[PDB]
Amino acid sequence: EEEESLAILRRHVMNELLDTERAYVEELLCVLEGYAAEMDNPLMAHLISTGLQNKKNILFGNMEEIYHFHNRIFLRELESCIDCPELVGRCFLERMEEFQIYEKYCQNKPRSESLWRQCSDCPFFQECQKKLDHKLSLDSYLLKPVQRITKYQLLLKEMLKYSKHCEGAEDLQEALSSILGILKAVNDSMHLIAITGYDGNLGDLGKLLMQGSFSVWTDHKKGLARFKPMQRHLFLHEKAVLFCKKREENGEGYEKAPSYSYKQSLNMTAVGITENVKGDTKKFEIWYNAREEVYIIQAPTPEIKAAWVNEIRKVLTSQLQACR
Amino acid sequence: AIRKKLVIVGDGACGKTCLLIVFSKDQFPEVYVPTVFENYVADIEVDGKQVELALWDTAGQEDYDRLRPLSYPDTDVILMCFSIDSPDSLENIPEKWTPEVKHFCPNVPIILVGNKKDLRNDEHTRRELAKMKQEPVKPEEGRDMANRIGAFGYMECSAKTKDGVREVFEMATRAALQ
């Protein structure tokens, strides 16, 4: 019957979840001892300089913190669902906070990437690899936390597909959304730390809600970009919207990723929004001060327009409930 | 032995992970298709030269533009692909993937791939597509895109029939040795 096979498929997803999880924990430990700990091993000191030894934290980031979480907590809780696989959604839900540690890891990854580029040919690694008997270099292992965090939604989506009629279909959908939310937040923060020239602290701007590149037109009142749109990268914050100009950077890898030169900033308390614009369902206007300053945003798709409109309105709605 | 890095890119649900599964294990999963494909090194030999091809999956990171590049460092060849039964995924090849792959991996050979060729003659998918005012992707369209982006070659395969699988990785390994 159908109920039959779906429970079989729920079983498969639960298995891959537990297997890949154990492997993930093993692989991390494998690197934390076969490389990171070996950096403080006297018998190896003759293959490693003092500089590299100090950069250990840049190279590994908070891998250890991550390993303890999965080894001491998450793998243990996933196993407790071996019996009721539809309830795995609750594990993520009760640990959404602990997953925040992945932001620190991803934000530091490009720093590690740059370092690895300068120290990969170092004798130490070639030696640790040999000892460990790995056909792959430390670089393949250092990406695992990023690869793992970005597989959980896939797995939860698979579990949810086979649990439409189970007593946990709702917790699964919530968990899926929660992970997707953490992944979006982490990805947004990557762009944020690439902003340059900001006069002040970004932290007190409130939470970063959205970011993206758009073609922007202006239509201000009285004393450029009225016909030929300008290309800005926006950052929607609880307190303000930042306008940045993509600055092209050159280098080897992630160094190629652009930076964002801070240009202007609209304080949300004076921001207003026009959802519908004549002639383009993909445009929406973010105006300032009684509309004496109007910015027409060219959303690449309806979904993006909607997300931004929605986020702006939530913020504007809070402002209201707070201004009284 | 020679070591080369292959990073497979493209839209999610276009068959990426499955293709790697079929190639590395030489057998299409029947009941459950794995979601996870962790970095694996496959032994392949072309032009009488033994190569250790490191296969890096990217499934699950298509929606994150700042986490995606983290995989590109030191890539020898890129398997950029779309789904034969999705003219949409193909539109991203030039619109999304190519500009990116070329920016982080300059001068790195690209092998355009059309997955799920077997679904081209499948009436079921032909029907569903019609509703969306679409039809399967025609080989002619593939080669065009392949040259439009400047690929090292176009290729089609089927994870179900394993038809063309070996050929894809064999051709990509060659482009990597160049």
From Swiss-Prot, chain A:
Residues 9-189 form the DH domain. Signal peptide: none annotated. It is found in: Cytoplasm; Cell membrane. Residues 218-321 form the PH domain. Expressed at low levels in several hemopoietic cell lines and in thymus and spleen, and at higher levels in other tissues, particularly in brain. Guanine nucleotide exchange factor that catalyzes guanine nucleotide exchange on RHOA and CDC42, and thereby contributes to the regulation of RHOA and CDC42 signaling pathways. Seems to lack activity with RAC1. Becomes activated and highly tumorigenic by truncation of the N-terminus. Belongs to the MCF2 family. The DH domain is involved in interaction with CCPG1. Interacts with GTP-bound RAC1. Interacts with CDC42. Interacts with RHOA. Interacts with CCPG1, which results in specific inhibition of its exchange activity toward RHOA, but does not affect its activity on CDC42. This is Guanine nucleotide exchange factor DBS. The lineage of its organism: Eukaryota, Metazoa, Chordata, Craniata, Vertebrata.
From Swiss-Prot, chain B:
It is a lipid-anchor. Changing residue 45 to K: In EDFAOB; somatic mosaic variant; decreased Rho protein signal transduction; decreased substrate adhesion-dependent cell spreading; decreased number of stress fibers assembly; decreased cytoplasmic microtubule organization. One of its GO terms (biological process) is cellular response to cytokine stimulus. Disulfide bonds: none annotated. There is a cross-link at residue 133 (Glycyl lysine isopeptide (Lys-Gly) (interchain with G-Cter in ubiquitin)). The modification (Microbial infection) ADP-ribosylasparagine is found at residue 39. The gene is RHOA. This is Transforming protein RhoA. It is linked to Ectodermal dysplasia with facial dysmorphism and acral, ocular, and brain anomalies: A neuroectodermal syndrome characterized by linear hypopigmentation, alopecia, apparently asymptomatic leukoencephalopathy, and facial, ocular, dental and acral anomalies. Patients show no intellectual or neurologic impairment. It comes from Homo sapiens (Human).
